[PDB]
Ligand SMILES: [Zn+2]
């Protein structure tokens with residue numbers, strides 16, 4: 097027997113002596129041998145700590161011989177390596193656990209934690225919990241592989257967090273994915289959108305101006321305004337613009353019962369399909385007021401905005417232009433109302449400014465294209 101124990105100890109030294117320092121002790125009835133890894137000539141402190149924690153809490157006082165040791169592996173992130181910890185218990189019966197635990201490390205042996213992966217730890221945790229539920233941050237157990245963050249498991253595409261990722265930690269494949277994401281994010285597109293029409297006294301001039309400047313827009317029209325304006329609605333579509341649904345009569349939809357709010361929307365789908373032959377399946381709630389139940393009841397995408405021109409409030413062409421100059425960003429969806437003269441009058445200067453800054457004007461379907469799904473809310477190209 098004694099010779100058998102000696103052979104186990106000799107085998108482990110033959111396997112593990114190099115690059116490790118060997119600790120030996122008894123705890124209770126257990127004999128323990130731990131191989132702590134060196135980085136250069138120094139014990140990796142956070143690995144020694146993880147082993148010692150297991151010794152305190154989980155090591156049972158049985159007549160056994162217990163070994164701990166580690167192996168270095170790649171982490172899947174640039175400049176980060178992992179130590180996997182194996183625990184083996186001999187009673188000759190034996191049982192081992194590989195990756196009993198794992199620590200992530202800089203190449204020089206210092207702790208790397210999940211929060212360091214992100215430029216914004218607070219937002220990332222928020223994004224992680226969100227994607228997590230759909231399926232301290234530093235203390236989160238994780239792995240990284242095949243372009244996914246693995247939570248302890250739960251595997252989440254890394255692409256979902258590119259908004260808050262520290263991209264310098266990405267290896268080649270992920271860095272090319274991030275580059276593509278960044279280039280798309282910096283594509284200079286804007287969607288002009290107009291609520292509350294058609295209005296026979298102003299919409300025709302808006303159409304003439306959009307045609308002059310060789311751009312398209314998206315018009316969220318009221319069902320009640322379609323009667324008597326059918327040829328105007330057809331003209332909006334004939335000139336290449338997109339027509340969406342702005343309810344029948346402009347109530348606060350979230351303050352109606354579910355079926356009355358749904359019917360405000362489907363009555364408007366009905367009249368638009370009758371006049372145009374088709375629906376874009378885009379719906380913008382009056383006042384931005386909507387509920388989850390209404391959204392989940394209808395096969396439509398709900399289009400909000402991120403830039404309010406304030407045309408409705410300022411009623412002033414110079415103010416409208418200033419708001420556009422200061423607020424418009426890549427991917428913005430701009431709210432205007434094609435029902436009063438300040439907006440009509442301001443439009444040429446707004447378009448000239450944005451084209452002079454290098455923007456492309458897009459329709460909502462052009463902007464959202466792949467992203468558009470039933471029930472969902474959209475505030476901009478990306479949000
Ligand atoms: Zn085994």
Ligand SMILES: [Zn+2]
Nearest residue numbers: 291292382383
């Ligand atoms: Zn409106």
